[PDB]
Amino acid sequence: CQDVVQDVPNVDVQMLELYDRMSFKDIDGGVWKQGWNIKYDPLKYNAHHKLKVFVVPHSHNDPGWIQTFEEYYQHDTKHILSNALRHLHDNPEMKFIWAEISYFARFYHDLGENKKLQMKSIVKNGQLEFVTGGWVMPDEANSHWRNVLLQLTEGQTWLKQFMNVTPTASWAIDPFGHSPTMPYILQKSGFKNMLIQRTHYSVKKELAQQRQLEFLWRQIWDNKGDTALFTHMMPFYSYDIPHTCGPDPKVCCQFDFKRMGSFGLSCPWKVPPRTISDQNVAARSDLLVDQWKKKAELYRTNVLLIPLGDDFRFKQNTEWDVQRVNYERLFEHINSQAHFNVQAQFGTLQEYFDAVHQAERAGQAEFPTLSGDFFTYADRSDNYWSGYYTSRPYHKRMDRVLMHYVRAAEMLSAWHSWDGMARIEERLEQARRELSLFQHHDGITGTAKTHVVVDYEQRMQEALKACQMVMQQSVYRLLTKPSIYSPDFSFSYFTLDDSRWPGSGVEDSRTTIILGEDILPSKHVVMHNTLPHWREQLVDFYVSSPFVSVTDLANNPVEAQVSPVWSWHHDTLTKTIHPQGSTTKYRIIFKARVPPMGLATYVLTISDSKPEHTSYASNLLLRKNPTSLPLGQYPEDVKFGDPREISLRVGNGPTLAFSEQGLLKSIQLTQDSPHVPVHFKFLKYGVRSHGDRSGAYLFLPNGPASPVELGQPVVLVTKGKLESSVSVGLPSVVHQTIMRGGAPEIRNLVDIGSLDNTEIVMRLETHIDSGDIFYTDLNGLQFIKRRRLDKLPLQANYYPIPSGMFIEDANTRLTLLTGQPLGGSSLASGELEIMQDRRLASDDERGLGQGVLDNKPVLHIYRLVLEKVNNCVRPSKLHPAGYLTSAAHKASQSLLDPLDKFIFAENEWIGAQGQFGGDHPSAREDLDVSVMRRLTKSSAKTQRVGYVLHRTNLMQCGTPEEHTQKLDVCHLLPNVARCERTTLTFLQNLEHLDGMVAPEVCPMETAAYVSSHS
Ligand SMILES: *[C@@H]1O[C@H](CO)[C@@H](O)[C@H](O)[C@H]1NC(C)=O
Ligand SMILES: N[C@H]1[C@@H](O)[C@@H](O)[C@@H](O)[C@H]1O
Ligand SMILES: [Zn+2]
């Protein structure tokens, strides 16, 4: 295993180093506005060395943006695919690349058999080529790597099954900025090449000048280079035709033959395309070939890529003709005019890459090595695209919830083979597909129109219900004596209980367990733990009486705590935000202990008075002018007081101090240690009154943020033996700090209501001497070092926070882990800040045509980990990566993959068992079974189960932490007959494994295995 901490990779281009050196001046470069006047030596190309040009036709089809997926499919995409089928069938040399499998599968299944055969034939012969092959072209900023892999797998599994092809070249022309997580997953999924486009105009200029637009992109920690994936970055401002034939859009626009008028399109540079004829072909070719030769100077080989397309292009038959015919005339002239020394033709993406590598092997070029990312993107001037790191945060949080429910549903149901009547495969496929669709770059990014966002939300809601159905049927089968198990596949044996989604104050959706002497004395609940190690975690349920006690299935008592059910209300009468307690439902909390990838059953039983092993939290409402808060039979009366500073400590955990406004002011790790200053503050960013306005994509603040005026907020303090908390009703945010004995959990119920042109940010102020350095993660997979650059505007220093961020000095680190992707930064030494929601009245001129005014209450969740790191073995100062500690990693897992909770729905569960998985191996803490998926239906004689194993890398900080078992996924199911290492999509076998044993992976590596069972 490579060491991912101690050896700084030696690469030709390291993006953080490049950023430190670059000046980012935005000067007018001439017709290439963001470049310079390119010059070339006409003698470079000659009879023995021609310029091979590949014109690659394409059509960018968004699975939802301005229209929903289905509206685009009906109005545009089905016609584009239908006409592509006809036109390619009829014109053997014409080519076309297709990226979005969600649309392709939708089309293909509607085709009659004769057309399915013609489509397979044009794919088989190479005229229509799939690029990437994922369900969508995902966002690369907010998406979790697990969902990037799920959607890639959903589209490639469909392509292998129906088209018998697996793309090895990727095409990502539209995500707003690019992540090295893509080459990471692709190279482990059989890919050999990838293409990207949206990178900062200054980066395009800088790499173009050194001919470093093509590079072997390796991971920032990869010293050997085995993760490297050849990458081509497009050089210009857009992937449309005006910005893909060469440096001058006024000339390239003349070669988009769809712009002559009848299609309603035109050239903004005021010179229209003209139909190619024998009288103008020499002059038109001379213009086009000169653009091509200028583009060619930016690359190292004699093979040139010329994409030919734009959004939802190649829809009409007349459009196919007008582009194909005019280009065929140009190629016939150019290729027969030796003085151009060019051979041009229609080609596919793979053809371009194969020819580039042939040039490379012939010794004509060597490519530079590069590591780093391409965030934060700016397409022009100071318009940095950091706003979409936060836009539509309710759905960004929903993304993470469904991410987990999909994994849990696939894992719980993988243990058995199911009869087709159970509709398990059906429900799982629907859930994987709706979550995969939302990975689109207008889905999770929050850049779609309002009704499209609603469509993604409905799809995800149906996916969540599908996951629940599968999960609860699976729990019932796993925990019921087999000879008693009598399933009704449409029945709800259990309902899931989720404390954080939609979240208290977002939706009253949780059911109350109703117990009573005259109706039902007890109720079974079951917890599932998707992680491969024993895990304990507090779980809570609503119950109809405070006198409830908990036992495990051996009837051993379990210590429990009951707290009131508090809801916050914006009282329109008193004009205050304050909590009301329920006088009929209460919260019971207890520690559940669950086996690796397993289940554990508990029983809640009512009694007529306080049970022996249940304690009751005290509650203290701090506000001036209080009124009574009765709580029904809750046994402890609520106490009141004027606002004041308070201090809490749960268990042996840290002691946290709060200000009289209910916000954290310090954390004391142990009895003796100092009260380290850590202050939470809420501020607001506004919008500029002149110049460019912030919108769903762009963040253009009118300066640093201003403090939210807090007034004298109501603060609620609940203190319990297992859980305590401090909650405060601030303008737009009920902010809650929850303590259970370790790093606190923070929850914000964010309702920006009608505060127009406002962005609400949560900031942490510490005295940590971080300077200009901070770390943020990429797709929940790795942490990358960031350096605040005062030479760039505030919004350029915002980066995606898909799951965590941290600051540190020689001795102290503060890590903020998130349960949803949001945007954030460290704008001054010792600070961390992360945007909660943004409500923008204006459109930001990128085509959405509306602002963001559809905000809804969202419950954001986090874990805040303050730690001493002076003893940790950290990467040197020059290493571009950072790594979490064991505590920060476990806190991230507590947010993203919590225990699942199930409540038995009927009155009695006959045949109930108390546990599943007690014999599953409890793997080392840095290993995860990211995916467990049965790959075969019940009629397959040989069953197959796939696993994706991911090992993260945690800092060595001196804690011995051993005693774990080797996890061999190939032996998790019995009767194994074969074990293979496969690509991450499970589509290709890479290694037949000895002894049918799946070795564990190295730190920061991910591997996939498939076990076969007789
Ligand atoms: C699928 O593609 C492979 C590779 O070209 C070919 O050999 C095979 O016959 C095709 N159809 C099958 C057998 O699935
Ligand atoms: N090019 C446009 C469409 O393709 C959408 O994805 C927009 O967000 C924009 O990028
Ligand atoms: Zn797009």
CATH number at residue 593: 2.60.40.1180
**Nearest ligand to residue 126 Cα:** 1
**Nearest ligand to residue 172 Cα:** 3
The response to whether residue 311 sits with its C-beta less than 6 Å from ligand 2 reads yes
User: 226 C-alpha vs ligand 2 centroid, how far in Å?
Assistant: 33
Q: Which tokens in the block code for residue 907? A: 């009155």
Ligand 2 nearest-atom number relative to CA 60: 4
Using CA positions, which residue lies closest to atom 8 of ligand 2?
A: 442
Residues 530, 536, 541, 543, CA torsion sign: positive
Which of 492, 523, 546 is the last residue in one of the domains?
492
CA–CA gap between residue 874 and residue 868 (Å, rounded): 13
Let me know whether 99 and 237 are in one domain.
yes
Neighbouring C-beta atoms of residue 785, cutoff 10 Å: 18
CA–CA gap between residue 660 and residue 728 (Å, rounded): 10
Ligand 2 nearest-atom number relative to CA 697: 8
The response to whether residue 268 sits with its C-beta less than 6 Å from ligand 2 reads no
The response to whether residue 61 sits with its C-beta less than 6 Å from ligand 2 reads no
Q: What is the resolution of this structure in A?
A: 1.9
- Of the residues 58, 60, 171, 391, which should be mutated to test ligand 2's pocket, given the most ligand atoms within 8 Å of the CB? 60
The response to whether residue 549 sits with its C-beta less than 6 Å from ligand 2 reads no
Neighbouring-strand partners of residue 783? 777, 882
Using CA positions, which residue lies closest to atom 3 of ligand 2?
A: 62
**Nearest ligand to residue 988 Cα:** 1
Let me know whether 314 and 216 are in one domain.
yes
- Say which residue the tokens 């874990």 belong to: 863
DSSP letter, residue 520: B
Q: Is 457 left (phi over 0), alpha (psi -120 to 50) or beta?
A: alpha
Neighbouring C-beta atoms of residue 704, cutoff 10 Å: 10
Let me know whether 602 and 650 are in one domain.
no
What does 71-137 look like in DSSP terms, one character per residue?
HHIIIIIHHHHHHHHHHHHH-TT--EEE--HHHHHHHHHHS-HHHHHHHHHHHHTTSEEESS--SS-
Q: Which tokens in the block code for residue 516? A: 């009573």
Q: Which tokens in the block code for residue 720? A: 């319990």
**Nearest ligand to residue 447 Cα:** 2
The response to whether residue 60 sits with its C-beta less than 6 Å from ligand 2 reads yes
Task: Confirm if 146 and 928 have CB atoms less than 8 A apart.
Answer: no
- Of the residues 311, 379, 380, which should be mutated to test ligand 2's pocket, given the most ligand atoms within 8 Å of the CB? 311
User: 910 C-alpha vs ligand 3 centroid, how far in Å?
Assistant: 53
DSSP letter, residue 627: -
CA–CA gap between residue 681 and residue 678 (Å, rounded): 10
The response to whether residue 65 sits with its C-beta less than 6 Å from ligand 2 reads yes
Alpha-carbon distance values, 382 to 25, 65, 202, 692, 698 (Å): 11, 24, 11, 9, 10
Which of 873, 889, 919 is the last residue in one of the domains?
919
Range of the domain at 997: 920-1014
User: 147 C-alpha vs ligand 1 centroid, how far in Å?
Assistant: 29
User: 174 C-alpha vs ligand 2 centroid, how far in Å?
Assistant: 7
The response to whether residue 100 sits with its C-beta less than 6 Å from ligand 2 reads no
Angle at CA 634, nearest 5°, toward 628 and 640?
A: 30
- Work out the burial of residue 363: count CB atoms within 10 Å of its CB; fewer than 13 is exposed, 13-18 middle, 19 or more buried: exposed
**Nearest ligand to residue 120 Cα:** 1
Let me know whether 526 and 552 are in one domain.
yes
CA–CA gap between residue 177 and residue 171 (Å, rounded): 14
Using CA positions, which residue lies closest to atom 1 of ligand 2?
A: 174
The response to whether residue 62 sits with its C-beta less than 6 Å from ligand 2 reads yes
Let me know whether 57 and 188 are in one domain.
yes
User: 173 C-alpha vs ligand 2 centroid, how far in Å?
Assistant: 10
Ligand 2 nearest-atom number relative to CA 311: 4
Task: Confirm if 656 and 665 have CB atoms less than 8 A apart.
Answer: no
Query: What are the strands, taking DSSP E only, across 745-857?
Result: 745-750, 758-766, 773-778, 782-787, 799-801, 804-808, 812-818, 822-825, 831-839
The response to whether residue 442 sits with its C-beta less than 6 Å from ligand 2 reads yes
User: 848 C-alpha vs ligand 2 centroid, how far in Å?
Assistant: 8
Let me know whether 846 and 753 are in one domain.
yes
Let me know whether 246 and 367 are in one domain.
yes
- Work out the burial of residue 225: count CB atoms within 10 Å of its CB; fewer than 13 is exposed, 13-18 middle, 19 or more buried: middle
Alpha-carbon distance values, 828 to 680, 767, 836 (Å): 15, 10, 19
DSSP helix/strand/coil, 939:
coil
Which of 475, 492, 509 is the last residue in one of the domains?
492
The response to whether residue 665 sits with its C-beta less than 6 Å from ligand 2 reads no
Let me know whether 137 and 228 are in one domain.
yes
CA atoms within 13 A on the CB side of 795: 28
User: 861 C-alpha vs ligand 2 centroid, how far in Å?
Assistant: 30
Neighbouring-strand partners of residue 38? none
Neighbouring-strand partners of residue 776? 784, 805
User: 164 C-alpha vs ligand 1 centroid, how far in Å?
Assistant: 7
- Work out the burial of residue 878: count CB atoms within 10 Å of its CB; fewer than 13 is exposed, 13-18 middle, 19 or more buried: exposed
The amino acid occupying position 567 is S
CA–CA gap between residue 124 and residue 112 (Å, rounded): 18
The response to whether residue 67 sits with its C-beta less than 6 Å from ligand 2 reads no
Alpha-carbon distance values, 685 to 53, 706, 760 (Å): 48, 7, 7
Let me know whether 738 and 846 are in one domain.
yes
Let me know whether 597 and 635 are in one domain.
no
Neighbouring C-beta atoms of residue 498, cutoff 10 Å: 17
Method for structure elucidation: X-ray
H/E element, 883 = none
**Residues designated catalytic:** 174
Q: Estimate the share of the chain in helix, then strand, then coil, as percent rounded to the nearest 5.
A: 25, 30, 45
Which of these, 243, 228, 244, 174, lies nearest to 13 by C-alpha position? 228
CA–CA gap between residue 512 and residue 585 (Å, rounded): 7
- The number of helices, as runs of H, and strands, as runs of E, in the chain is 16, 51
Which of these, 885, 882, 807, lies nearest to 16 by C-alpha position? 882
Task: Confirm if 524 and 603 have CB atoms less than 8 A apart.
Answer: yes
**Nearest ligand to residue 697 Cα:** 2
Alpha-helical runs (H) found in 709-818: none
CA–CA gap between residue 542 and residue 497 (Å, rounded): 9
Task: Confirm if 956 and 873 have CB atoms less than 8 A apart.
Answer: yes
Q: Which tokens in the block code for residue 898? A: 């919590």
The response to whether residue 441 sits with its C-beta less than 6 Å from ligand 2 reads yes
Q: Helices 145-163 and 113-124: crossing angle, nearest 10°?
A: 110
Residue 296 CB partners (closer than 8 Å, separation 6+): 40, 51, 302, 304
DSSP letter, residue 510: P
Q: What is the tally of structural domains in the chain? A: 5
The response to whether residue 849 sits with its C-beta less than 6 Å from ligand 2 reads no
Ligand 2 nearest-atom number relative to CA 174: 10
Let me know whether 886 and 824 are in one domain.
yes
Which of these, 383, 386, 436, lies nearest to 143 by C-alpha position? 436
The response to whether residue 174 sits with its C-beta less than 6 Å from ligand 2 reads yes
Using CA positions, which residue lies closest to atom 10 of ligand 2?
A: 174
CATH number at residue 464: 1.20.1270.50
Let me know whether 282 and 142 are in one domain.
yes
User: 120 C-alpha vs ligand 1 centroid, how far in Å?
Assistant: 12
DSSP helix/strand/coil, 390:
coil
User: 441 C-alpha vs ligand 3 centroid, how far in Å?
Assistant: 6
